Ligand binder design. Structure first.
Ligand code: HEM
Ligand code: HEM
Ligand SMILES: CCc1cc(CNC)cc(OCc2ccc3ccc(N)nc3c2)c1
Ligand SMILES: CCc1cc(CNC)cc(OCc2ccc3ccc(N)nc3c2)c1
Ligand SMILES: C[C@H](O)[C@H](O)[C@H]1CNc2nc(N)[nH]c(=O)c2N1
Ligand SMILES: C[C@H](O)[C@H](O)[C@H]1CNc2nc(N)[nH]c(=O)c2N1
Ligand SMILES: [Ca+2]
Ligand SMILES: [Cl-]
Ligand SMILES: [Cl-]
Ligand SMILES: [Gd]
Ligand SMILES: [Gd]
Ligand SMILES: [Zn+2]
Lengths: 402, 404
């Protein structure tokens, strides 16, 4: 009674036994599917914790040992005394990797095991926070040869407030409101931009102005931190065979570093644990630039391409979109900044589902997020059925601290 | 009442229609299965409840609920089912039901047209030769010299004991798929099996990669029988690209009328195992899925070479380049040949329009996100940024076991 999953390009069939362990509940019932929605005490902490420890002890093939029982006894004894507990460092490393491994909407998961984990749980202020962050950015960027990294700030704990990073990503561009009621820069970041300003940031007026950090120490207002310019590797965008493209003045940044997600390991919550890998060209090419509610350059590129934008059947949108993606790939290659196209990405994800079926008897996957936003059926994930479910450890969304 | 958002505009709606969904789907709180093609798998007290529910909403949609013919029609069905164990549908009901089934089909992106559907009543059919005639009139009417018109043909309902009417082809028009000493395929690999059956039932096989299959039509109990389609009834379109002159030389063609002949029409509790419906192609169906899928015509790399693309690195986006041009060739050829066709952009926008219509009228619309979003340029179409609720309403089209 495990979901039969087919690959339609090949003919292969597997059953997802791993789904039957899903440690949390989703938005769907047999009445109605909601898969397409973006946003779907002590003893209960003990049962999550006990579950994680079992996981950790399985992965180090010391399952059901002395050190395993002792560790359970340790944890329940500490939840007694303090109403919480502390992860050992190896447990944290494993927990951070599993969280990525379990992230259903991530197409880059072939890499899950190669994650660099920086432990900043000793962190003290917004100031020490800023430094750890700059170091994350420095290590992960690595002069354009990107490394996967995660910095883990102190856990949610009884008595103190949370560390929070107010910014959605470590590097993001300003979005300013206007006289036309419109936005200059990235419309997705108008709110946080408003917040930065009113917290003492002297704004600019470009379309690619990098935002300051708003960092929050427990029980403090947020504190504004300017990123040292030379720490933010950017990539000016140019097209390999369309020379007017460089005159669009478009740029994107090297490091995709998501900074507003919560990391959950064994019932413990880390509201601040920014992570980063490297871009798939489509996030920038199609989503960041061509979404109407974003930079929305599609028509502008299409006109310049001298496509016929009168009628849809000329497929001007598709033609413009493909060139913008080529431009992004080319520019990142010219600059020696790591980048993966959607065909390479989805192909390593197939390898991933295959590694995962042998290893854990399945792989939690969100089809609508895994299939790229152009060339969908041109990639192998489109033809693959997938089971979506929530495993812990995990990254979760959390509400904006403001 | 699920909250549903559109991220392009920011707007919010509540799907209240979802609440009235009965026949449970595949998903549970613990695991989503929306991405699966065939959800899970494939004493007549039940027939009545399905029947009364269908009749009620029939009369709802003409205001005539409460008093009048409404009460009256409830007992006739009661009587009929009490008497016979089944019931016949009034011709208006049949029309209403066929229309609703199209309206409820969450995977269909062209439902904005659901009101303009021609129902050919063929319940008074008792022969395979007869079906063939019905199927032929459908094809003629639907095709209409390339000015396509949605039509369905409804054959007799399934009866307790004794057989079924059934079209063994998945569609009325399908190309041949021939195996060999390679295991590879000349023609369409999706139709390999039904080409096996066609041949084993007497059909004299053909040249190769665009031979229209013959039909395999099955009247109740008595075994299936082959019927050759009159070549003047099968409108086709040779594929030519507007500016890439060599494209025609590739000798690609595709047919005109997409006509699904294996799905099961279910109205008011009654099951119609044979109800061939048809409409017109959205371009990507042919351009992207049919010609470019690795397990279909798989032509993508071939077009790429001719375009002299760098097939040596995936990051050249050669696949993406080839696929657009193939799609442009499809739309161009269909237009030149004056055959109704719709591009993915136009279609999706009309589906957004359909969604807002369906919000005001029924309080929502069942939509299968993964099937509504086109197979290329997804995030470039408005449906991509629209959240969708997927659920099952009756009347419906349902998939059904094949007759083997
Ligand atoms: C190194 C190469 C990586 C690639 C190519 C990649 C690719 C992607 C893409 C394209 C998405 C969809 C995001 C969107 O459409 O906005 C995604 C989602 C996600 N990724 Fe990865 N990623 C990488 C690294 C990582 C790392 C290092 C982590 C964590 C340690 C991670 C965790 C996640 C999570 C939690 C999501 C879902 C986020 C959400 O639902 O908003 N990824 N990934
Ligand atoms: C007239 C214009 C129409 C357009 C442009 C259109 C387009 C589409 C598309 C793109 C799909 C996705 C399925 C696939 O690509 O394989 C689909 C599915 C479907 N359509 Fe429509 N369609 C039209 C008319 C109709 C009509 C007239 C009916 C019934 C009378 C219908 C019933 C269905 C059903 C039941 C499905 C689900 C198919 C399946 O899951 O096997 N459609 N349609
Ligand atoms: C609304 C939630 C959301 C939206 C969007 C973009 N919407 C236009 C992106 C979201 O996640 C964005 C994300 C997360 C993790 C990543 C890891 C690596 C990588 N290269 N990109 C990522 C990108 C979440
Ligand atoms: C297997 C279920 C399935 C497969 C496939 C193709 N697989 C490569 C198509 C399916 O639906 C195919 C379909 C059904 C109804 C349509 C109505 C109108 C139209 N233009 N196209 C349709 C196309 C169902
Ligand atoms: C409404 C829809 O679910 C939403 O736009 C999703 C669809 N799939 C996606 N897939 C990825 N990878 N990223 C996204 O932002 C989205 N957006
Ligand atoms: C596995 C996946 O759900 C499957 O390939 C679906 C995806 N979306 C689709 N959408 C349409 N319109 N037609 C299809 O055949 C499919 N295939
Ligand atoms: Ca060459
Ligand atoms: Cl981004
Ligand atoms: Cl088809
Ligand atoms: Gd040029
Ligand atoms: Gd040449
Ligand atoms: Zn679901």
């Amino acid at each position: 009674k495990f979901p039969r999953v087919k690959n339609w390009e090949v003919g292969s069939i597997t059953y997802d036994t791993l789904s039957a362990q899903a440690q949390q509940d989703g938005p769907c019932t047999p009445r109605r599917c909601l898969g397409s929605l973006v946003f779907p005490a002590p003893e209960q902490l003990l049962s999550q914790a006990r579950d994680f420890i079992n996981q950790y002890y399985s992965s180090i093939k010391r399952s059901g040992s002395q050190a395993h029982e002792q560790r359970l006894q340790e944890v329940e004894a500490e939840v007694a005394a303090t109403g919480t507990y502390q992860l050992r460092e190896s447990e944290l490393v494993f927990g951070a990797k599993q969280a990525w491994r379990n992230a259903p909407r991530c197409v880059g998961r072939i890499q899950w095991g190669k994650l660099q984990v920086f432990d900043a749980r000793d962190c003290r202020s917004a100031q020490e926070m800023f430094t750890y962050i700059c170091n994350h950015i420095k290590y992960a960027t690595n002069r354009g040869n990107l490394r996967s990294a995660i910095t883990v700030f102190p856990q949610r704990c009884p008595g103190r407030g949370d560390f929070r990073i107010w910014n959605s990503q470590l590097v993001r561009y300003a979005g300013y409101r206007q006289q036309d009621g419109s936005v200059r820069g990235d419309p997705a970041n108008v709110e946080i931009t408003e917040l930065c300003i009113q917290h003492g940031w002297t704004p600019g007026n470009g379309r690619f102005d990098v935002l300051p950090l708003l960092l929050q120490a427990p029980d403090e207002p947020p504190e504004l931190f300017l990123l040292p310019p030379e720490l933010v590797l950017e990539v000016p965008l140019e097209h390999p065979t369309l020379e007017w493209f460089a005159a669009l003045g478009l740029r994107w940044y090297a490091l995709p570093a998501v900074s507003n997600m919560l990391l959950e390991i064994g019932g413990l919550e880390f509201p601040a644990a920014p992570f980063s890998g490297w871009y798939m060209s489509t996030e920038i090419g199609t989503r960041n630039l061509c979404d109407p509610h974003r930079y929305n350059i599609l028509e502008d590129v299409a006109v310049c391409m001298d496509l016929d934008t009168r009628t849809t059947s000329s497929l001007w949108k598709d033609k413009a979109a493909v060139e913008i993606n080529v431009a992004v790939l080319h520019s990142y290659q010219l600059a020696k900044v790591t980048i993966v196209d959607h065909h390479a990405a989805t192909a390593s994800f197939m390898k991933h589902l295959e590694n995962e079926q042998k290893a854990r008897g399945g792989c939690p996957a969100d089809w609508a997020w895994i299939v790229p936003p152009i060339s969908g059926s041109l990639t192998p994930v489109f033809h693959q059925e997938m089971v979506n479910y929530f495993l812990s450890p995990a990254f979760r969304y959390q509400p904006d601290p403001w």
